[model samples]
Target: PIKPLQEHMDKVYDCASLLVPFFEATITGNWDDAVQIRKQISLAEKQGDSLKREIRLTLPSGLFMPVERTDLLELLTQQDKIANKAKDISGRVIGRQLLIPQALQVPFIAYLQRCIDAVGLAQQVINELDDLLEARGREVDFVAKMINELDIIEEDTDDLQIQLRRQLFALESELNPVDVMFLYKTIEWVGGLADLAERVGSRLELMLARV
Candidate 1:
């Protein structure tokens, strides 16, 4: 008998948890560290991708007995994807030489810190959702509440980013096409990080309970 699915799933969670610090490294003026963190994130994604393949190949074998196992597999992959997105953003920043204001680094760091905290909260909500999935018949009202709260927090990060981008543009618009393309890519990629987090919360509602 192999290890439980949840055990493997938890490993994915552990990998995802690293995203907070990785993201923090970017906004905190540690671009060098962020590059290293991106490598780590790539490794974590491989870990998740391998597990996903195993789950897909073995799940049909009917060896593991877990409730909603397929859904659980999808959930694990979905959540792991957020970290992958963060990692990709880091790579984009490096390739494009995107720069954040060195002085504003502290505030940018603080802003994303909240997003990280919200992701943690969303992870807890997912924990609860997993339990609710296992037990069946359990009410998902609280999980929905948690997701909504997380969504609100996600919005705040967007607003914060918009404000910061405005400030960035105000400082200088010395961007060539490649520079502008990369800048656009960086912004979209960063936004993707938050969007994926909230998407995880929202998707849980559909996958784990009545939405």
Candidate 2:
């Protein structure tokens, strides 16, 4: 189950990664490139969904484990939400042909990169679960280190999001009101991917403490 979850996160990252190119295309008025990346994002999202469904259906309810079964399920669900939000962002770009303001592009790209970095940290934490279990909960120091890094990464993402929002507000007058609103919403949602990753790690921390 953990392995599949890792795979799902990889796809989630892939889905998130596509947005950089997609945004670049949108900013450049390259609708064709935007469409191409949109399709790739959709495909990556669907792959994540497939892995999620597999885990949901196959995860044994009766299997004995250190962590509560419910907690494991919740972690998987949270990961799924990250992938879903990535898809949502891509869909918004496709549906609206959103043009990221030239002024916001730099900060927006930074925000996206931070979001990806945060997700990468979360993924590393998740990947360590198997080894943690193998060590019979004696890897507290390592887990603590990873969780600390994850927190720091998430904080950086938070700061980037704030910077991006300020840029958006500054450029709001030059953009469509609705487009501005959606752009803000998109940033919030992208930030959420990191938020969910942190939550997932926190949940694991809880599980580790329990064991």
Candidate 3:
């Protein structure tokens, strides 16, 4: 049961890693390169969608597990949303040919890294599920600690987002009105990656509680 979930988790991480370069292309005004990366993201997203569908189809209606079937499905949905958002962001960048302002270049990379960090932590929690399942009674505390780290990571991302928003506002006079709006939208959507990672971690925390 967890094997499929694990595979999905791997692809979700790939999606984030791929986005790092894709964003770099967009920031540098490499529109052609960004378009190619968006294609890669779209391909990765399609693979994730296939895995999710297969898992849903094969998952038993009367499956026996420490966690509820519904909970597993819900967690999978949360994980999938991260990939979906990644694809959406890439598509938007490609479609709009978004230009990351000079002032925002460094801070944007930092903000993106924080988002990836949150996802990486969430991936760690998911990867440990098998080990956790094996030592259900004994590993509860250890898993709880890992999930707690995810909350801290998310908070850091939140703080970075605030700073990014401030920077965007400061440059409002230099940016086109529509570009400014879309840039803020981009920031919000990017931050949502970390938000979803925290949600995934919280869901795992709930699963651990059942154990």
Candidate 4:
């Protein structure tokens, strides 16, 4: 189960890693590159689904493990949301040829990168859990330390989300209303990358405290 779990996170990370370049292609008017990246993101997410499906089927009847089977399944759902959101973000942006406005570009990119950082950290933490679970899984102190870091990373994402929204608001009057709407939509979806990442940590913390 941990093998499949880790493998899916690896795929999720690749899906997200392409976002920045996908975004860059949009601003540069390179639909060619953007389309290619979208295909990769799409494929990564599909692969994640396959692993998650396998985990669901195998874990139900085959094991009586320290972790609750149902809880781990729930966590699997949460983990997939990152890849799912990546798919949707790419879906909307590429479908509409949505490009980030020049004035807001740098700040927005920073926000995206920060959100990606959260996802990466979540993956790293989850990857370490197999061995950590071996350490009796009662290292509440160690778990809190990692969870604390997840909190800080996510809080920074929250702050950037607001700042980017307000910054976008300033330019909203000059842009088409539809583009403005999607920009906000894109902002929220991007922020959800970190938002969902935080949930992954909290879920695991709960998973740890359970047994």
Per-residue lDDT tens digits of candidate 1, residues 24-133? Answer: 67666688897887778778778777776777787667754534556656666666676576566656666754665564455556555555665566566756655554
Among the numbered candidates, top lDDT falls to: 4
Model 3 lDDT per residue over 15-75, tens place: 8778889989888778888889888888888999999998888776655666688778998
Give the CA lDDT, 0 to 100, for residue 193 in model 3.
Answer: 89
Q: Is candidate 3 or candidate 4 better by lDDT?
A: 4
lDDT per residue for candidate 4 within 1-211, as digits (tens), equals: 5667788888888888789888988878899999998998999899989988888888888555777877788889999999999999999998888889998888898899999999999888888888777665346776877878877887888888888998999998899999999999999889889888878887888887777
- What global local distance difference test value does model 4 have? 0.86
lDDT values of the candidates? Answer: 0.62, 0.79, 0.85, 0.86
Comparing 2 and 3 on TM-score, the stronger one: 3
- TM-score of candidate 4 against the unseen true structure: 0.93
TM-score versus the correct structure, for each prediction: 0.73, 0.89, 0.93, 0.93
- Residue 25 deviation, candidate 2, in Å? 1.9
Ranking by lDDT: 4, 3, 2, 1
**Which of 2 and 4 is ahead in TM-score?**
4
What is candidate 4's CA lDDT for residue 170?
97
> Per-residue alpha-carbon lDDT of model 2 for 76-157, expressed as tens digits?
8877777777778878788987778888888888888888777777788888787876665366886779767877886877
